[PDB]
A = this chain, B = another copy of it.
Amino acid sequence: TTGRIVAVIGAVVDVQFDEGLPPILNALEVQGRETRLVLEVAQHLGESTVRTIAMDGTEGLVRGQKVLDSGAPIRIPVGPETLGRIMNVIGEPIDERGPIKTKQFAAIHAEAPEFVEMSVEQEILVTGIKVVDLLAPYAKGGKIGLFGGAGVGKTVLIMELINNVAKAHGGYSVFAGVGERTREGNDLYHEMIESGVINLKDATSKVALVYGQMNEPPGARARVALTGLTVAEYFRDQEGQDVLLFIDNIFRFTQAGSEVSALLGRIPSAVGYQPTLATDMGTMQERITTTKKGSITSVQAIYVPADDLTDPAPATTFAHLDATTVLSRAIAELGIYPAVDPLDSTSRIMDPNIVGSEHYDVARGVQKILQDYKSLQDIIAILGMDELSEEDKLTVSRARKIQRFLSQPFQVAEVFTGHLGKLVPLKETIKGFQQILAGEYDHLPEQAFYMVGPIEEAVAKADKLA
């Protein structure tokens, strides 16, 4: 079918059809352009007109221009030949390595797995990161979220996890760059090549890359997540594969939505966001999941605007995760990295019947002492410690030593910590924290605990501090 462009406003192109109106979600190709311009139908305004969302800049379009119904929704190359390749929202390669020659093609809009298809196995995923492992442990096939205001550690944490987990993972990985920096895509691609997870020589690549960055028009940013998502769904269900899915940043998808929403003509909801915010997050978040057919461990970075976690975007995302790592500017500014807020991160696995009571008791032990320190802080703030009880001062000592022992050097952040990256084994974490709690190091100085791996290194640092 051939329609005609009737109106153009930014990324919202209205096209009229005479015979055969395309259903909603169908991709149309604008005619008469140097490059592909896909339009995704969004709604039937009546009068044989359809309101659509462009997938690329709309400059140059002209009213009356011809548009062709592709007959289906954006469809993209899916299969193992996407492994080691970089692709677009609309599935075209952007790594200058030729066509992605796949047997099948999948449409980016699918329904979420049914209730009966759900899984409930809960396995802990150890990452080697002290704070995460001890207090808000991730889980295989689970959904993890790293909340962070600008420049707090979301990406560095994804990188370190890619290093500590993705690197020795049997099975595939999918990295979806949504609304982030292009240089980062470039930094990663080349790094992936270097460590050999991307091999441009053989078919041994274990990573497929999808990108729709900070330079794309809203509609592209609004759909690349769906695109990375689809790639991952193929490995899960069509190959019963155990997938790893990294997304930086899923907040950008929602923001993209807010960008076009006025153009679609909608009364805004709170904070200027689109009234369809939750459902849009929902039908999308619900496909990022493990099932009986396959496993999807997904780590999603969630940018928090103005640092406000009460913002509709981040606020609505908590409910979709199994584990959350809430990063803090306040902590970061103290020099504690990763800047994880220990009393604000959680994990549905923090259950005695899953991590064992030893783990469950150290975990709750650490939080209780930090919570206690937290209430003393108001008074410590005007009057310092003098007036504090001998007992209260011991919580304070221990709390400040536990707070420091929660920090740790990442390989990925070596250039900034000035120290060699460390990976601490769970039992080493459970332990080191026990002792601290138990008063076995009340003699060491705080600084001994800052930026170290295992407790054994904290004792040493103390000697060196003399």
Which residue numbers of A lie inside 8 Å of B, CB to CB?
378-379, 382-384, 387
Are A384 and B382 neighbours in the complex by a CB distance under 8 Å? no
Minimum Cβ distance to chain B for residue A377 (Å): 12
Minimum Cβ distance to chain B for residue A318 (Å): 23
How many copies the complex holds: the figure is 2
Contacts of A378 in B (CB 8 A): 382
Question: Complex: how many Å from CA A387 to CA B387?
Answer: 13
Minimum Cβ distance to chain B for residue A37 (Å): 31
Q: List 6 A-B contacts (CB under 8 A).
A: A378-B382, A379-B382, A382-B382, A382-B383, A383-B383, A384-B387
Question: Complex: how many Å from CA A379 to CA B384?
Answer: 10
Shortest beta-carbon contacts, A-B, top 6? A382-B382, A379-B382, A382-B383, A384-B387, A378-B382, A383-B383
Contacts of A379 in B (CB 8 A): 382
Question: Complex: how many Å from CA A379 to CA B379?
Answer: 11
Minimum Cβ distance to chain B for residue A375 (Å): 13
Question: Complex: how many Å from CA A378 to CA B379?
Answer: 12
Contacts of A384 in B (CB 8 A): 387
Minimum Cβ distance to chain B for residue A253 (Å): 27
Minimum Cβ distance to chain B for residue A309 (Å): 21
Question: Complex: how many Å from CA A387 to CA B385?
Answer: 13
Question: Complex: how many Å from CA A384 to CA B387?
Answer: 10
Minimum Cβ distance to chain B for residue A384 (Å): 7
Contacts of A382 in B (CB 8 A): 378-379, 382-383
Minimum Cβ distance to chain B for residue A376 (Å): 12
Contacts of A383 in B (CB 8 A): 382-383
Question: Complex: how many Å from CA A379 to CA B382?
Answer: 6
Contacts of A387 in B (CB 8 A): 384
Question: Complex: how many Å from CA A379 to CA B387?
Answer: 15
